[PDB]
Request: fold
Amino acid sequence: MPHAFKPGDLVFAKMKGYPHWPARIDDIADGAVKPPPNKYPIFFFGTHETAFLGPKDLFPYDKSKDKYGKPNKRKGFNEGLWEIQNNPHASYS
Reply:
């Protein structure tokens, strides 16, 4: 049975105006800016951007990849597909 989201979990994350996007739950580094309450820091593969999202916009990757894990013309998307499949836990700074 599922747990709450934790750092390192792999997802597709939904933002307004964007396709469901390959992403991970990030940690928050010591001394770094924390998210708002009930929000998680989401790192988006390919773009390497961070947004703060809640669970309603977070789709576990394993369950969802058949539906959402296909190429997209959008900038960074296909790089992001490679990242989440091949090195999802790397440093992308």
About this structure: The radius of gyration is 13 Å. The longest helix spans residues 77-86. The chain has two helices and five strands.
